């Protein structure tokens, strides 16, 4: 079994495969948006345990110390 992160979104969840924890949060966001929304509304990721704060998209998954995130439209809240 590969590693993967859970992304909670407005209309369900997606499990996103990751090759390692050096992947950036930006890559995960892009994969989650493409799958769930398709082809400009903007989105953030939040750690599951820290509502209303955008994670740094340039940081690595490993630096988050978390495996579950919320995908939130920037003009909205979880």
């Amino acid at each position: 079994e590969s590693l993967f992160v859970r992304i909670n979104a407005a209309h369900g969840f997606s499990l996103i495969q990751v090759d390692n924890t050096k992947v950036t949060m930006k890559e995960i966001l892009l994969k989650a948006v493409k799958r769930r929304k398709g082809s400009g509304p903007q989105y953030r990721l939040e750690k599951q345990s820290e509502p209303n704060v955008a994670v740094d998209l340039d940081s690595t998954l490993e630096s988050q110390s978390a495996w579950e995130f919320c995908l939130v439209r920037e003009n909205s809240s979880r």
């Binding site: 079994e1 590969s2 209309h11 369900g12 969840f13 997606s14 799958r35």
Partner: protein
């Protein structure tokens, strides 16, 4: 607020489970193959004049994620058992999904539809009569679909909701 139906799409890798789900939810055909681990999609729909919420679970066909079946099989309220009409091994694999649903539900009573997908393709290796006979042996409907053309897609998912409503 409204009634929610937990529908689960199962079947071998590559048969079009994700494409069927996205064609239903977003009216869009996904041309690329990105293998699923697990994804859920919720959408409000009207079926036979009555509004409800569909909660569709798109599952992994890849055997490396087979351990997750137990969980989603327990709470799934109806199942699309999908094979591809140009893939005889995916047709052979249908029975294994049904048997696992039986181990955790203690029966196969659960609403289920046998779905033969990719019917837009010219080359077929699963005969229609063979799929009809399999569905008859299970006592469930057989519906031919194409996630590409949308043929049969609403019929497949809505048949599950109708079967749940009529229990």
């Amino acid at each position: 607020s409204m009634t929610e139906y937990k529908l689960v799409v199962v079947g071998a890798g590559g048969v079009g489970k994700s494409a069927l789900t996205i064609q239903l939810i977003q009216n869009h055909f996904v041309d690329e193959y990105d293998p699923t681990i697990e994804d859920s999609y919720r959408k409000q729909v009207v079926i036979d004049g009555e509004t409800c919420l569909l909660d569709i679970l798109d599952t992994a066909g890849l055997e490396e994620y087979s351990a997750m079946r137990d969980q989603y099989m327990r709470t799934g309220e109806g199942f699309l058992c999908v094979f591809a009409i140009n893939n005889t091994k995916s047709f052979e694999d249908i029975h294994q999904y049904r048997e696992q649903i039986k181990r955790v539900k203690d029966s196969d009573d659960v609403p289920m539809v046998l779905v033969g997908n990719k019917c837009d393709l010219a080359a077929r290796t699963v005969e229609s009569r063979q799929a009809q006979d399999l569905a008859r042996s299970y006592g469930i409907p057989y519906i031919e679909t194409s996630a590409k053309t949308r043929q049969g897609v609403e019929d497949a998912f809505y048949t599950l909701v109708r079967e749940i409503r009529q229990h």
